[PDB]
Amino acid sequence: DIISVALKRHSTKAFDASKKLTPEQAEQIKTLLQYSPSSTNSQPWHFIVASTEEGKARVAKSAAGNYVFNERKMLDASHVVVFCAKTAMDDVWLKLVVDQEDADGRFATPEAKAANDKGRKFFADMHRKDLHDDAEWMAKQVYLNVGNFLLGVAALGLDAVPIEGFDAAILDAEFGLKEKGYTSLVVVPVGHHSVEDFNATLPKSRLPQNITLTEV
Amino acid sequence: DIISVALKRHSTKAFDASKKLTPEQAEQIKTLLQYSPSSTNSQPWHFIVASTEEGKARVAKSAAGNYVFNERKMLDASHVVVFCAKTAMDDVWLKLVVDQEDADGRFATPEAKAANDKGRKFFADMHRKDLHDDAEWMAKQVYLNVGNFLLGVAALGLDAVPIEGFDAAILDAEFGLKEKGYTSLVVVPVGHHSVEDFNATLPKSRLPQNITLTEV
């Protein structure tokens, strides 16, 4: 029951370090990351999945200064996913996407492929040429992926917490992201909460629909 | 099985206009919209849910020019959700949120309420005062909501399609959004796909994880 899932999930504030994902769960979270939708199937993303103690420690380097209050979340979780966006949408990437759709059998003719390519380039060009906002456009797709992921892991029975409170300059440098054409946006530790997760026993709060919703 | 849901959902290209969701089903999609997470529980969003012939026709005015390929999706679907972001993060909104958390019983002391406000304002100020990107920051939270929503409605057994191919200036004007403090970002028609939805049976395509994913 997905409504139950959405109401019962919460942002975990403390993880049980003794509780790890099963091998199947580890495969399943990667599937969730991969199969998120995105505008034009542009998939303008990279994920770092940290499962080792060293890998997690490397990510937790970003929980520094004002962000130290998120360090233990990264360290004690089973798996920590860093969601990264491309910094620029280039034609090489657009070619990878369309070539992949072709390999998967989505095009009946070379002319269907070309038309799909031209449509995708229309949207990309709107951002990278007209509005000069392709960085933010791609970042939006990554945040969409994040929303999909949080509901997904909850439906798997897994605890998680989305994290914007991290130093992306430190995290980018740690994984050489800038040179590779990426930048880190959101860190999401995943696992099982401990008894120290104070947010497990607080009521969920949201603004009333009277404020956020209009019907016509 | 949420992985099955993830793999079997698709972007609907043709809706059965004879198949309306009940008011009770609409209640569930409104719950999904409301209960999405967001940075600091900022909830910097408004939703228009159009379900009448005239309501959807109003939204569909935005699918003009190069966007006519999306017009029929907005007209034929049962319930069409316009995701909107706030255009600026104001102090009044921040107070609304923390007061709601208080009303919902999340603070045992005044200092706990004050701490939550202070933390929230730290992030808000980072965006609106330092980076001058609060509009983009909030739009990112709205895209996260969209990701949650697309997986959610799929898990309810409902078809949908996310739409960026609309003229947001036209949609904003039609619903007077800008002077209200909002701007439209994504239109999501929801309903049941028709047998003429070619995309319901086309193979799904994603880049392999060997490109997009790094394990450490």
UniProtKB/Swiss-Prot annotation, chains A, B:
Keyword Acetylation belongs to the record: no
Lineage, uppermost ranks: Bacteria, Pseudomonadati, Pseudomonadota, Gammaproteobacteria, Enterobacterales
Pfam families assigned to the protein according to its UniProt record, in alphabetical order: Nitroreductase (PF00881)
Organism: Escherichia coli (strain K12)
SUPFAM superfamilies noted in UniProt: FMN-dependent nitroreductase-like (SSF55469)
Tree of life domain: Bacteria
Protein name according to UniProt: Oxygen-insensitive NAD(P)H nitroreductase
Catalytic activity: 5,6,7,8-tetrahydropteridine + NAD(+) = 6,7-dihydropteridine + NADH + H(+); 5,6,7,8-tetrahydropteridine + NADP(+) = 6,7-dihydropteridine + NADPH + H(+)
Subunit note: Homodimer.
Primary role: Reduction of a variety of nitroaromatic compounds using NADH (and to lesser extent NADPH) as source of reducing equivalents; two electrons are transferred. Capable of reducing nitrofurazone, quinones and the anti-tumor agent CB1954 (5-(aziridin-1-yl)-2,4-dinitrobenzamide). The reduction of CB1954 results in the generation of cytotoxic species.
Cofactors (names): FMN
Protein residues bound to FMN: 9-13, 70, 164-165, 204-206
Keyword NAD belongs to the record: yes
PANTHER family on file: NADPH NITROREDUCTASE, OXYGEN-INSENSITIVE NAD(P)H NITROREDUCTASE
InterPro entries cross-referenced by the UniProt entry: NfsB-like (IPR033878), Nitroreductase (IPR029479), Nitroreductase-like (IPR000415), Nitroreductase/BluB (IPR050627)
Residue numbers binding NAD(+): 13, 40, 70, 73, 106
An example Gene Ontology molecular-function term: identical protein binding
Enzyme class per UniProt: oxidoreductase
Keywords tagged on the record: Flavoprotein, FMN, NAD, NADP, Oxidoreductase
